[PDB]
Amino acid sequence: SGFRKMAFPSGKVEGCMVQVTCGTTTLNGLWLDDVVYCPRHVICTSEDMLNPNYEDLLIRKSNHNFLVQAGNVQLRVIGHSMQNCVLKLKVDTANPKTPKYKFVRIQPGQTFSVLACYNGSPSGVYQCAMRPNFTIKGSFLNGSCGSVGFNIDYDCVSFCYMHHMELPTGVHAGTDLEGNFYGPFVDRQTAQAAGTDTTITVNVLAWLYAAVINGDRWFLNRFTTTLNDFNLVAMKYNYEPLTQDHVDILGPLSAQTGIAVLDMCASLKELLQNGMNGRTILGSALLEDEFTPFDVVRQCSGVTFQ
Amino acid sequence: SGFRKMAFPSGKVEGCMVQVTCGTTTLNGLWLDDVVYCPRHVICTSEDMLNPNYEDLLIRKSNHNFLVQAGNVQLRVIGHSMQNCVLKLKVDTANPKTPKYKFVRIQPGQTFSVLACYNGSPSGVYQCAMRPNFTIKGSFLNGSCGSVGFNIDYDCVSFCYMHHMELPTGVHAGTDLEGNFYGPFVDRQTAQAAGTDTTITVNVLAWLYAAVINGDRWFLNRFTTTLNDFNLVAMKYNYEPLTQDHVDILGPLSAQTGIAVLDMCASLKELLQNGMNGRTILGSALLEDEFTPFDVVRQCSGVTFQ
Ligand SMILES: *[C@](O)(C(=O)N1CCC1)[C@H](CN1CCCCC1=O)NC(=O)[C@@H]1[C@@H]2[C@H](CN1C(=O)[C@@H](NC(=O)C(F)(F)F)C(C)(C)C)C2(C)C
Ligand SMILES: *[C@](O)(C(=O)N1CCC1)[C@H](CN1CCCCC1=O)NC(=O)[C@@H]1[C@@H]2[C@H](CN1C(=O)[C@@H](NC(=O)C(F)(F)F)C(C)(C)C)C2(C)C
Numbered sequence: 306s307g308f309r310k311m312a313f314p315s316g317k318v319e320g321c322m323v324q325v326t327c328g329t330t331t332l333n334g335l336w337l338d339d340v341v342y343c344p345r346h347v348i349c350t351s352e353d354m355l356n357p358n359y360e361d362l363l364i365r366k367s368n369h370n371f372l373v374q375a376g377n378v379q380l381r382v383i384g385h386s387m388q389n390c391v392l393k394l395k396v397d398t399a400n401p402k403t404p405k406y407k408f409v410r411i412q413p414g415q416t417f418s419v420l421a422c423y424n425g426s427p428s429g430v431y432q433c434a435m436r437p438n439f440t441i442k443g444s445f446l447n448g449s450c451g452s453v454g455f456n457i458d459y460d461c462v463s464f465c466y467m468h469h470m471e472l473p474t475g476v477h478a479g480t481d482l483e484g485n486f487y488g489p490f491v492d493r494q495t496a497q498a499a500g501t502d503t504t505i506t507v508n509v510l511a512w513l514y515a516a517v518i519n520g521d522r523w524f525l526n527r528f529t530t531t532l533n534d535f536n537l538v539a540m541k542y543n544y545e546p547l548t549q550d551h552v553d554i555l556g557p558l559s560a561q562t563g564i565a566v567l568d569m570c571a572s573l574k575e576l577l578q579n580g581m582n583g584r585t586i587l588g589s590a591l592l593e594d595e596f597t598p599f600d601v602v603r604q605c606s607g608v609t610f611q
Numbered sequence: 612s613g614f615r616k617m618a619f620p621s622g623k624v625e626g627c628m629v630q631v632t633c634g635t636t637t638l639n640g641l642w643l644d645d646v647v648y649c650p651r652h653v654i655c656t657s658e659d660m661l662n663p664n665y666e667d668l669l670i671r672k673s674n675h676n677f678l679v680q681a682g683n684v685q686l687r688v689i690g691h692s693m694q695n696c697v698l699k700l701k702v703d704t705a706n707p708k709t710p711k712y713k714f715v716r717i718q719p720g721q722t723f724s725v726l727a728c729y730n731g732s733p734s735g736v737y738q739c740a741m742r743p744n745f746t747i748k749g750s751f752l753n754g755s756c757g758s759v760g761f762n763i764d765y766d767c768v769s770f771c772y773m774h775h776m777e778l779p780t781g782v783h784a785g786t787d788l789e790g791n792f793y794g795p796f797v798d799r800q801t802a803q804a805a806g807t808d809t810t811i812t813v814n815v816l817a818w819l820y821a822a823v824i825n826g827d828r829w830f831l832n833r834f835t836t837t838l839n840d841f842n843l844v845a846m847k848y849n850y851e852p853l854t855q856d857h858v859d860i861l862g863p864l865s866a867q868t869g870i871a872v873l874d875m876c877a878s879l880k881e882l883l884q885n886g887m888n889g890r891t892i893l894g895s896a897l898l899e900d901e902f903t904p905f906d907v908v909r910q911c912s913g914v915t916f917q
């Protein structure tokens with residue numbers, strides 16, 4: 306037993322990271338097949354980044370302006386194009402360590418692993434959720450741009466995030482691997498604000514199930530509720546609405562524990578109204594909303610990723 | 612910026628995990644060079660595990676009783692010996708993916724990454740601390756025995772933990788890679804108790820520095836204290852004594868932030884006496900003691916692990 310914030314194993318992604326340099330800007334790229342993908346602001350000086358014209362910077366560049374390194378090997382670039390906010394560099398060598406992979410655009414409330422990299426080299430791995438306001442709460446220093454977010458599905462890496470920037474509040478914003486931002490952000494160094502955040506209700510319920518599985522059961526009550534009556538109460542605490550889709554997704558936890566979803570909702574309703582009454586759940590004094598139902602099943606049933 | 616519980620990248624370890632089977636007991640092993648290391652209770656039936664005689668079980672086994680698989684390949688075992696609570700299996704094939712490595716015995720208060728595995732296959736990665744009572748708070752289901760804990764130092768994996776069991780309180784116990792337990796536990800299915808835990812003071816101070824680096828500064832006060840006077844107060848809250856060694860180790864954080872260690876101790880003293888006054892630090896309502904000073908520098912300066 307036990308419950309921990311767990312990242313996917315990172316090996317399959319570690320063998321795809323390279324260092325991309327253009328002029329004196331250096332960041333990370335992801336080498337899959339004969340293509341390297343990286344943030345397009347690799348073509349900016351830091352002054353350009355205050356107000357960039359990427360198309361105009363890119364025309365002035367040729368293949369030879371891009372230095373791509375994988376450990377000791379330089380990779381000769383033989384083509385380039387821009388897709389939204391991502392730069393695609395065609396190279397003369399396919400990556401032999403390319404895993405089976407897909408590009409995916411994730412939904413608010415879904416989690417992924419981040420492999421934080423500096424100079425093409427992996428530094429660490431952690432879990433993030435895509436917030437309802439389309440930001441993530443990560444850990445990224447200078448050089449971390451181009452670090453990617455991902456999920457593993459057996460042998461297949463789904464890439465879902467590439468890191469670009471940090472907002473004035475300290476949270477993080479990036480793109481899918483087709484270079485489309487999550488949320489209304491642009492790759493320019495100017496003040497921009499995220500929407501106010503909300504709590505991912507389905508994820509709090511999945512954590513309450515994890516808690517029960519792990520023996521923490523003091524918050525369980527004898528009541529049920531209706532979806533409608535739960536959403537009316539929760540709304541005021543800035544919880545996002547729970548839909549019937551979410552109820553269906555929680556069904557496996559429900560069946561594993563023998564506690565109906567609307568029985569758990571009745572427990573959560575009382576926690577929001579009354580507080581935690583000087584008690585913890587899974588060691589935490591606050592409700593946690595960054596585990597998906599899948600994360601809980603994965604961890605509290607034992608699913609692995611060849 | 613940002614601060615997250617971060618694991619080392621797991622690739623170097625992922626290529627060392629194999630599945631070991633003996634009879635109808637299956638668990639994980641670590642394949643380095645031509646040796647596989649695994650928990651010795653792989654030779655037990657579940658009935659044996661209630662009260663095992665490992666030496667007597669092992670004499671009855673020969674090399675051919677051990678089935679070791681790496682993905683599709685079976686590895687023929689050509690020798691076996693027991694070292695404390697670990698079983699060493701000599702195999703006919705050296706692991707070509709063996710990283711530079713060392714075996715290390717860690718101290719209470721030190722952190723490591725755990726690669727949780729099932730059937731030789733990696734499931735996930737997380738950070739743990741070795742508690743002062745020599746347990747860890749992990750996440751381990753049936754099949755997870757033989758999962759290892761580790762640190763990376765540039766290119767070198769230091770292996771420090773191999774998972775064996777879970778205690779009646781839900782916390783976890785294991786051995787170093789020479790098969791010596793951390794703490795007074797034995798590999799037998801019988802009631803055993805950990806010492807009462809204590810809080811790792813140096814780690815709470817390193818987290819307070821992380822917090823300051825990340826802009827959370829409300830708990831900073833204008834006072835200093837003496838090491839002696841801090842330890843007198845903290846003792847009563849079941850904080851472990853802060854030594855001059857610990858002060859020296861915190862020096863880098865101190866210099867990065869310009870806040871003397873005994874200035875921070877004066878802040879921590881007031882937090883213990885007065886409480887957190889309905890405020891959080893780095894998002895947490897409780898003090899966190901599972902980041903080492905090194906973890907903080909690593910994450911809030913950007914160190915990577917080729
Ligand atoms: C990223 O550019 C990078 O790693 N490198 C460029 C060469 C190496 C860098 C990553 N990073 C470092 C600063 C702390 C957090 C972080 O994500 N990203 C950036 O510096 C982007 C980049 C410029 C400005 N920028 C920002 O993140 C900035 N934010 C903003 O201006 C705002 F949107 F949030 F308001 C600063 C945090 C630097 C102020 C691009 C947006 C193109
Ligand atoms: C480990 O044996 C394993 O993964 N496998 C055996 C074949 C696959 C297993 C891992 N595990 C599964 C149960 C939940 C937590 C956990 O660590 N470890 C064990 O089952 C050990 C093993 C027996 C008994 N054991 C225990 O962990 C037990 N604990 C105790 O008896 C006590 F020390 F804590 F009191 C139980 C949790 C199973 C009660 C060995 C000690 C040899």
Ligand SMILES: [Cl-]
Binds near residue numbers: 894
């Ligand atoms: Cl908390």
